[PDB]
Design a protein around this ligand. Structure first.
Ligand SMILES: OC[C@H]1O[C@@H](O[C@H]2[C@H](O)[C@@H](O)[C@H](O[C@H]3[C@H](O)[C@@H](O)[C@H](O[C@H]4[C@H](O)[C@@H](O)[C@H](O)O[C@@H]4CO)O[C@@H]3CO)O[C@@H]2CO)[C@H](O)[C@@H](O)[C@@H]1O
Ligand SMILES: *[C@@H]1O[C@H](CO)[C@@H](O)[C@H](O)[C@H]1NC(C)=O
Ligand SMILES: [Cl-]
Ligand SMILES: [Cl-]
Ligand SMILES: [Cl-]
Ligand SMILES: [Cl-]
Ligand SMILES: [Cl-]
Ligand SMILES: [Cl-]
Ligand SMILES: [Cl-]
Ligand SMILES: [Cl-]
Ligand SMILES: [Cl-]
Ligand SMILES: [Cl-]
Ligand SMILES: [Cl-]
Ligand SMILES: [Cl-]
Ligand SMILES: [Cl-]
Ligand SMILES: [Cl-]
Ligand SMILES: [Cl-]
Ligand SMILES: [Cu+2]
Length: 235
């Protein structure tokens, strides 16, 4: 159970984005149905009134929370990977338009899942804004919680992988457009019951055998990490 509060650009807090530049759902409940339109941008996907201005090479940081800002973020039971996708705003998330910019699943070095790291980072994870065409974008951050992913939703709707999905409206202003954005994948559509990483048992399989759902990270992606960039107590 987790939601995006807002974003930071280059370490500078853009302010509370809920229902403003984030297409926020009414609450922190997971999406589970792989075929639902809810997989795109969660349960209240509509245009919200603002969009965060960035330039290529900027660091764009999502900030998540559980109940209140900078709290425990997400229950530590919710082990799983984190991903960020991008699509042109013109699409409204439809079609084969989602390009992956970041993936983190299990870090063998630290023996930590992405979600575990996210807690330590106070909810913050970032991507470097790529050299795509100027214009309007949706960045879709996705946390997959695996604590009931030993079942499939399609077979048992009380269990299943849980998706915490948040779409931010981002305006890319300055960019040389030297990595024109490719075709991506559809949400719903890319994840199916057979997809690696959707059904997995985190209690018996070793985490080092986890494989995150494809697609793989686009080669034009400029990086990102799960790491606190700013202090919510102070700005
Ligand atoms: O530990 C592994 C074990 O876990 C079992 O599943 C548990 C989860 O571990 C636990 O984290 C989860 O807790 C949920 C709870 O179900 C929700 O009702 C609650 O929703 C809250 C929300 O958190 C608040 O922010 C909001 O204001 O109120 C709503 C209540 O309306 O969210 C918490 C998580 O934060 O519960 C699971 C069981 O239901 C697995 O099933 C088991 O297989 C694993 O082995
Ligand atoms: C999942 O969503 C699909 C497409 O909207 C819908 O037809 C199906 O009823 C859903 N499954 C459940 C259990 O609600
Ligand atoms: Cl739960
Ligand atoms: Cl709010
Ligand atoms: Cl609800
Ligand atoms: Cl659902
Ligand atoms: Cl609205
Ligand atoms: Cl605006
Ligand atoms: Cl708050
Ligand atoms: Cl708390
Ligand atoms: Cl950190
Ligand atoms: Cl349920
Ligand atoms: Cl540039
Ligand atoms: Cl589908
Ligand atoms: Cl992986
Ligand atoms: Cl990858
Ligand atoms: Cl690629
Ligand atoms: Cu939860």
């Amino acid at each position: 159970h987790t939601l995006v509060w807002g974003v930071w650009v280059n370490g500078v807090d853009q302010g509370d984005g809920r229902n403003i530049y984030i297409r926020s759902p009414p609450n922190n409940n997971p999406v589970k149905n792989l075929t639902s339109p809810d997989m795109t941008c969660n349960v209240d996907n509509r245009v919200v009134p603002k969009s965060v201005p960035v330039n290529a090479g900027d660091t764009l940081t999502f900030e998540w929370y559980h109940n209140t800002r900078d709290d425990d973020i997400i229950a530590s039971s919710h082990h799983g990977p984190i991903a960020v996708y991008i699509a042109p705003a013109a699409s409204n998330g439809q079609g084969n338009v989602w390009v992956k910019l970041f993936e983190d699943a299990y870090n063998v070095t630290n023996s930590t899942w992405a979600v575990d790291r996210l807690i330590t980072a106070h909810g913050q994870h970032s991507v470097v804004v790529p050299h795509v065409a100027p214009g309007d974008y949706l960045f879709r951050a996705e946390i997959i919680a695996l604590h009931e992913a030993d079942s499939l939703y399609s077979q048992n709707p009380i269990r299943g992988a849980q998706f915490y999905i948040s779409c931010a409206q981002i305006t890319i202003n300055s960019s040389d457009d030297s990595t024109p954005l490719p075709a991506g994948v559809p949400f719903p559509g890319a994840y199916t019951d057979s997809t690696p990483g959707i059904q997995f048992n985190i209690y018996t399989t070793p985490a080092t055998s986890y494989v995150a759902p494809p697609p793989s990270v686009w080669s034009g992606a400029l990086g990102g990490s799960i790491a606190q960039v700013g202090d919510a107590s102070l700005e």
